[PDB]
Design a protein around this ligand. Sequence first.
Ligand code: BGC
Ligand code: CA
Length: 305
Amino acid sequence: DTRIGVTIYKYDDCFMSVVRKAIEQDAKAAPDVQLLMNDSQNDQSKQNDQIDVLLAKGVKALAINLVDPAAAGTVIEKARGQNVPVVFFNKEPSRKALDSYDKAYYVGTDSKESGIIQGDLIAKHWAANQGWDLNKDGQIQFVLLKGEPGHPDAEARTTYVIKELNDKGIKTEQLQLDTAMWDTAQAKDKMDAWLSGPNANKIEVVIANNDCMAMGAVEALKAHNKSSIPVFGVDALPEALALVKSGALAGTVLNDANNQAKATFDLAKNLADGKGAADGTNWKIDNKVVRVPYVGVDKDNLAEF
Ligand SMILES: OC[C@H]1O[C@@H](O)[C@H](O)[C@@H](O)[C@@H]1O
Ligand SMILES: [Ca+2]
């Protein structure tokens, strides 16, 4: 049997819980493979110790979902000590980090694409709902709930949702922006504060970098009887799709957990076996990276998801 060590940055991350379960399902098809699954409990120091333990247990590959993206180098040097391949997933290392070790790979997404798609969804809905322009100034007065600072998805989704709106001719005014660290409760509390402050009446649209934060905002809006304000997310979690159906969420963007899990597993297994990373698969690896497309979702195409 081939042992592959896997770390998930925290099992209670909504999206990574989906990915974790998918990778375990994929491991069923490989009777020759054993995954050693680790919850890093949102602590890079805990993850680092877990990786040491995995390497001591003789794993032939690592699949690592970092707590801290900047810690890729640290993790690479651990893997290098055993000359073990490492497939990073979902939190993208720098190009320099990936190039520092020939056995380091990455599976994830084109982060900017999710921001562009989200911006196009907002543009569509804004044009179709001019009642959303509460102050009739032709600009979107928005608040934005950001993911972890420095996380490539948080940075790209935040930059590109606004860039895309602006590029499409829709001016925007940032009323508030803060991180809620990908978390529902923090997002709910932050949105509630914004709704309880002076100038809460100016808020026209809520933009969240993910669905779990969007869901927290939905709950805060409900508490204030402000559900007329639209909310947009990213991931297309099942719970989020149910809120698209009910009208509580205006739109989201599928982050394809199933294919990211499958690519991570396939590459890790090949690398563990000493084969080419993409051998026997149709994955297109571009300079050691696989990116899986995002797809926008709203009521108009929900039936497809
Ligand atoms: O790294 C974890 C984060 O990954 C992102 O791609 C997802 O959209 C977030 O929901 C998740 O919290
Ligand atoms: Ca306005």
